[PDB]
Coordinates of all heavy atoms in Angstrom, one line a residue:
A1 N 23.7 8.1 26.6 CA 23.7 9.4 27.3 C 24.4 9.3 28.7 O 24.8 10.4 29.2 CB 22.2 9.8 27.4
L2 N 24.5 8.2 29.2 CA 25.0 8.0 30.5 C 26.6 8.3 30.5 O 27.0 8.6 31.6 CB 24.8 6.5 31.2 CG 25.3 5.3 30.5 CD1 26.7 4.8 31.1 CD2 24.3 4.1 30.8
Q3 N 27.3 8.2 29.4 CA 28.6 8.8 29.3 C 28.7 10.0 28.7 O 29.8 10.6 28.4 CB 29.4 7.7 28.5 CG 29.0 7.4 27.1 CD 28.2 6.1 27.0 OE1 27.8 5.6 28.0 NE2 28.0 5.8 25.6
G4 N 27.6 10.7 28.4 CA 27.6 12.0 27.7 C 27.7 12.1 26.3 O 28.7 12.7 25.8
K5 N 26.7 11.5 25.5 CA 26.7 11.4 24.0 C 25.7 12.5 23.5 O 25.0 13.2 24.4 CB 26.7 10.1 23.4 CG 27.9 9.3 23.5 CD 27.7 8.0 22.8 CE 29.0 7.3 22.8 NZ 28.9 6.0 22.1
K6 N 25.4 12.4 22.3 CA 24.5 13.4 21.7 C 23.1 12.9 21.9 O 22.8 11.7 22.2 CB 24.8 13.7 20.1 CG 26.2 14.5 19.9 CD 26.6 15.5 20.9 CE 25.6 16.7 20.9 NZ 26.1 17.7 22.0
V7 N 22.1 13.8 21.6 CA 20.7 13.4 21.6 C 20.3 12.6 20.4 O 20.5 13.1 19.2 CB 19.7 14.7 21.7 CG1 18.3 14.4 22.1 CG2 20.4 15.7 22.7
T8 N 19.7 11.5 20.6 CA 19.1 10.6 19.6 C 17.7 10.9 19.3 O 16.9 10.8 20.2 CB 19.4 9.1 19.9 OG1 20.7 8.9 20.2 CG2 19.0 8.2 18.6
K9 N 17.3 11.1 18.1 CA 15.9 11.3 17.7 C 15.1 10.1 17.7 O 15.5 9.1 16.8 CB 15.7 12.1 16.4 CG 14.4 12.5 16.0 CD 13.7 13.4 17.1 CE 14.4 14.8 17.1 NZ 13.8 15.7 18.0
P10 N 14.2 9.8 18.5 CA 13.4 8.5 18.5 C 12.5 8.4 17.3 O 12.4 9.3 16.4 CB 12.7 8.4 19.8 CG 13.2 9.6 20.6 CD 13.6 10.6 19.6
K11 N 11.8 7.2 17.3 CA 10.7 7.1 16.3 C 9.4 7.1 17.0 O 9.2 6.5 18.2 CB 10.8 5.6 15.6 CG 11.4 4.6 16.5 CD 11.7 3.2 15.8 CE 12.3 2.2 16.7 NZ 12.4 0.9 16.1
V12 N 8.4 7.8 16.4 CA 7.1 8.1 17.1 C 6.3 6.8 16.8 O 5.7 6.6 15.8 CB 6.4 9.3 16.5 CG1 5.1 9.6 17.3 CG2 7.4 10.5 16.5
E13 N 6.2 6.0 17.8 CA 5.6 4.8 17.8 C 4.3 4.8 18.7 O 4.3 5.1 19.8 CB 6.5 3.5 18.3 CG 5.9 2.1 18.2 CD 6.8 1.1 18.7 OE1 6.9 1.0 19.9 OE2 7.4 0.3 17.9
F14 N 3.2 4.3 18.0 CA 1.9 4.1 18.7 C 1.6 2.6 18.8 O 1.9 1.8 17.9 CB 0.8 4.9 17.9 CG 0.8 6.3 18.2 CD1 1.8 7.2 17.8 CD2 -0.3 6.9 18.8 CE1 1.8 8.5 18.0 CE2 -0.4 8.2 19.2 CZ 0.6 9.1 18.7
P15 N 0.9 2.2 19.8 CA 0.5 0.8 20.0 C -0.6 0.5 19.1 O -1.5 1.3 18.8 CB 0.2 0.6 21.4 CG -0.4 2.0 21.8 CD 0.4 3.0 20.9
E16 N -0.7 -0.7 18.5 CA -1.6 -1.4 17.5 C -1.7 -0.4 16.3 O -2.8 -0.1 15.8 CB -3.0 -1.5 18.2 CG -2.9 -2.1 19.6 CD -4.4 -2.4 20.2 OE1 -5.3 -2.3 19.4 OE2 -4.4 -2.8 21.4
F17 N -0.5 0.1 15.9 CA -0.6 0.9 14.8 C 0.2 0.2 13.6 O 1.4 -0.3 13.8 CB 0.2 2.3 15.1 CG 0.3 3.3 13.9 CD1 -0.9 3.6 13.3 CD2 1.5 3.7 13.5 CE1 -0.8 4.6 12.3 CE2 1.7 4.6 12.6 CZ 0.5 5.1 11.8
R18 N -0.4 0.3 12.4 CA 0.2 -0.4 11.3 C 0.5 0.5 10.0 O 1.0 0.0 9.1 CB -0.7 -1.4 10.8 CG -1.0 -2.7 11.7 CD -1.8 -3.7 11.2 NE -3.1 -3.3 10.7 CZ -4.3 -3.3 11.6 NH1 -4.1 -3.7 13.0 NH2 -5.4 -2.9 11.1
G19 N 0.4 1.9 10.2 CA 0.7 2.8 9.2 C 2.1 3.3 9.2 O 3.1 2.5 9.1
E20 N 2.3 4.5 9.0 CA 3.5 5.2 9.1 C 3.5 6.5 9.9 O 2.4 7.2 9.8 CB 4.1 5.4 7.7 CG 5.5 5.6 7.4 CD 5.9 6.3 6.1 OE1 5.0 6.6 5.4 OE2 7.1 6.2 5.7
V21 N 4.7 7.1 10.4 CA 4.7 8.3 10.9 C 5.9 9.0 10.3 O 7.0 8.5 10.4 CB 4.8 8.4 12.5 CG1 5.1 9.8 13.0 CG2 3.7 7.6 13.0
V22 N 5.7 10.2 9.7 CA 6.8 10.9 9.1 C 6.9 12.3 9.7 O 5.9 13.0 9.6 CB 6.7 11.0 7.5 CG1 7.7 11.9 6.9 CG2 6.7 9.7 6.9
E23 N 8.1 12.7 10.3 CA 8.2 14.0 10.9 C 8.7 15.1 9.8 O 9.8 15.0 9.3 CB 9.2 13.9 12.0 CG 9.6 15.1 12.7 CD 10.3 15.1 14.0 OE1 10.7 13.9 14.3 OE2 10.7 16.0 14.5
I24 N 7.7 15.9 9.6 CA 8.0 17.0 8.6 C 7.7 18.4 9.4 O 6.8 18.5 10.0 CB 7.2 17.0 7.3 CG1 7.3 15.7 6.8 CG2 7.6 18.0 6.3 CD1 6.1 15.4 5.8
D25 N 8.8 19.3 9.3 CA 8.8 20.7 9.9 C 8.3 20.8 11.3 O 7.6 21.8 11.7 CB 8.1 21.6 9.0 CG 6.6 21.4 8.6 OD1 5.7 21.5 9.4 OD2 6.4 21.1 7.5
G26 N 8.7 19.8 12.1 CA 8.1 19.7 13.5 C 7.0 19.0 13.7 O 6.7 18.2 14.8
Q27 N 6.0 19.1 12.8 CA 4.7 18.2 12.8 C 5.1 16.8 12.4 O 6.0 16.4 11.9 CB 3.7 18.9 11.9 CG 3.3 20.3 12.2 CD 2.1 20.9 11.6 OE1 1.8 20.3 10.4 NE2 1.5 21.7 12.2
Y28 N 4.0 16.0 12.6 CA 4.1 14.6 12.2 C 2.9 14.2 11.5 O 1.7 14.4 11.8 CB 4.1 13.6 13.5 CG 5.0 14.1 14.6 CD1 4.7 15.0 15.7 CD2 6.6 13.9 14.5 CE1 5.5 15.3 16.6 CE2 7.3 14.3 15.4 CZ 6.9 15.0 16.5 OH 7.7 15.4 17.5
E29 N 3.1 13.7 10.3 CA 2.1 13.2 9.3 C 1.9 11.7 9.7 O 2.9 10.9 9.5 CB 2.4 13.3 7.9 CG 2.3 14.8 7.4 CD 2.6 14.9 5.8 OE1 3.0 13.9 5.3 OE2 2.5 16.0 5.4
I30 N 0.8 11.2 10.3 CA 0.4 9.9 10.5 C -0.4 9.4 9.4 O -1.4 10.0 9.0 CB -0.5 9.8 11.8 CG1 0.4 10.3 13.0 CG2 -0.9 8.4 12.1 CD1 0.4 11.7 13.5
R31 N 0.0 8.3 8.7 CA -0.4 7.8 7.5 C -1.0 6.4 7.6 O -0.2 5.5 8.0 CB 0.6 7.9 6.4 CG 1.2 9.4 6.2 CD 2.5 9.3 5.3 NE 3.0 10.6 5.4 CZ 4.2 11.0 4.7 NH1 4.8 9.9 4.0 NH2 4.7 12.1 4.8
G32 N -2.3 6.2 7.5 CA -2.9 4.9 7.5 C -2.5 4.2 6.2 O -2.3 4.7 5.2
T33 N -2.8 2.8 6.2 CA -2.4 2.0 5.2 C -3.7 1.6 4.4 O -4.8 1.2 5.0 CB -1.9 0.5 5.6 OG1 -2.8 0.1 6.7 CG2 -0.5 0.8 6.2
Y34 N -3.7 2.0 3.0 CA -4.8 1.7 2.1 C -4.3 1.0 0.9 O -3.2 1.4 0.4 CB -5.6 3.0 1.8 CG -4.8 4.0 0.8 CD1 -5.3 4.1 -0.4 CD2 -3.7 4.7 1.2 CE1 -4.6 4.8 -1.4 CE2 -3.0 5.5 0.3 CZ -3.5 5.6 -1.0 OH -2.8 6.4 -1.8
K35 N -4.9 0.0 0.5 CA -4.6 -0.8 -0.5 C -5.5 -0.9 -1.7 O -6.7 -1.1 -1.5 CB -4.2 -2.3 -0.2 CG -2.9 -2.6 0.5 CD -2.7 -2.0 2.0 CE -3.6 -2.7 2.9 NZ -3.4 -2.1 4.3
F36 N -5.0 -0.7 -2.9 CA -5.9 -0.7 -4.2 C -6.0 -2.3 -4.4 O -5.1 -2.9 -5.1 CB -5.1 -0.1 -5.4 CG -4.9 1.5 -5.3 CD1 -3.8 2.0 -4.6 CD2 -6.0 2.2 -5.7 CE1 -3.7 3.3 -4.4 CE2 -5.8 3.6 -5.4 CZ -4.8 4.1 -5.0
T37 N -7.1 -2.8 -4.0 CA -7.4 -4.2 -4.5 C -7.7 -4.3 -5.9 O -7.5 -5.5 -6.5 CB -8.5 -4.7 -3.5 OG1 -9.6 -3.9 -3.6 CG2 -8.1 -5.0 -2.1
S38 N -8.4 -3.3 -6.5 CA -8.5 -3.3 -7.9 C -8.5 -1.8 -8.3 O -8.0 -1.0 -7.6 CB -9.8 -3.9 -8.3 OG -11.0 -3.2 -8.0
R39 N -9.1 -1.6 -9.5 CA -9.1 -0.2 -10.1 C -10.1 0.7 -9.3 O -9.8 1.9 -8.9 CB -9.5 -0.3 -11.5 CG -9.5 1.2 -12.2 CD -8.0 1.8 -12.1 NE -8.1 3.1 -12.6 CZ -6.8 4.0 -12.6 NH1 -5.8 3.5 -12.1 NH2 -7.0 5.1 -13.1
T40 N -11.3 0.1 -8.9 CA -12.4 0.9 -8.2 C -12.7 0.3 -6.8 O -13.8 0.5 -6.4 CB -13.6 1.0 -9.1 OG1 -14.0 -0.3 -9.5 CG2 -13.3 1.9 -10.3
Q41 N -11.8 -0.5 -6.3 CA -12.0 -1.1 -5.0 C -10.8 -0.9 -4.2 O -9.6 -0.9 -4.6 CB -12.3 -2.6 -5.1 CG -13.1 -3.3 -3.9 CD -14.5 -2.8 -3.8 OE1 -15.0 -2.1 -2.9 NE2 -15.3 -3.3 -4.8
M42 N -11.0 -0.7 -2.8 CA -10.0 -0.4 -1.8 C -10.2 -1.0 -0.5 O -11.3 -1.1 -0.2 CB -9.9 1.2 -1.6 CG -8.6 1.7 -1.2 SD -7.5 2.2 -2.5 CE -8.0 3.8 -2.8
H43 N -9.1 -1.4 0.2 CA -9.2 -2.0 1.5 C -8.3 -1.1 2.4 O -7.1 -0.9 2.1 CB -8.8 -3.5 1.5 CG -9.0 -4.1 2.8 ND1 -10.3 -4.4 3.3 CD2 -7.9 -4.5 3.7 CE1 -10.0 -5.0 4.5 NE2 -8.7 -5.1 4.8
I44 N -9.0 -0.7 3.5 CA -8.3 0.3 4.4 C -8.1 -0.6 5.8 O -9.0 -1.3 6.4 CB -9.1 1.5 4.8 CG1 -9.2 2.2 3.5 CG2 -8.3 2.4 5.8 CD1 -10.3 3.3 3.6

């Protein structure tokens, strides 16, 4: 930007965050990580 270029869209980063952030229609879906350890067991 110091030589006058276009606007770069950043990544919405939070500290101590391990999930995902997806920007849809202006809003941001923040998505936590959940894992299927088996059929009826889950670890978040």
Side-chain angles (χ1 to χ4, degrees):
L2 61 90
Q3 63 259 12
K5 286 188 174 174
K6 296 322 298 172
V7 193
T8 306
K9 184 63 68 178
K11 35 184 180 181
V12 188
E13 183 184 75
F14 279 69
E16 313 180 11
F17 180 56
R18 295 188 298 273
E20 199 198 14
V21 176
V22 175
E23 175 170 356
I24 311 166
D25 55 71
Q27 303 189 330
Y28 314 97
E29 292 180 354
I30 297 89
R31 300 166 190 182
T33 50
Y34 75 106
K35 277 74 69 177
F36 295 90
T37 51
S38 69
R39 185 62 185 174
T40 50
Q41 201 73 244
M42 199 93 84
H43 185 71
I44 303 167

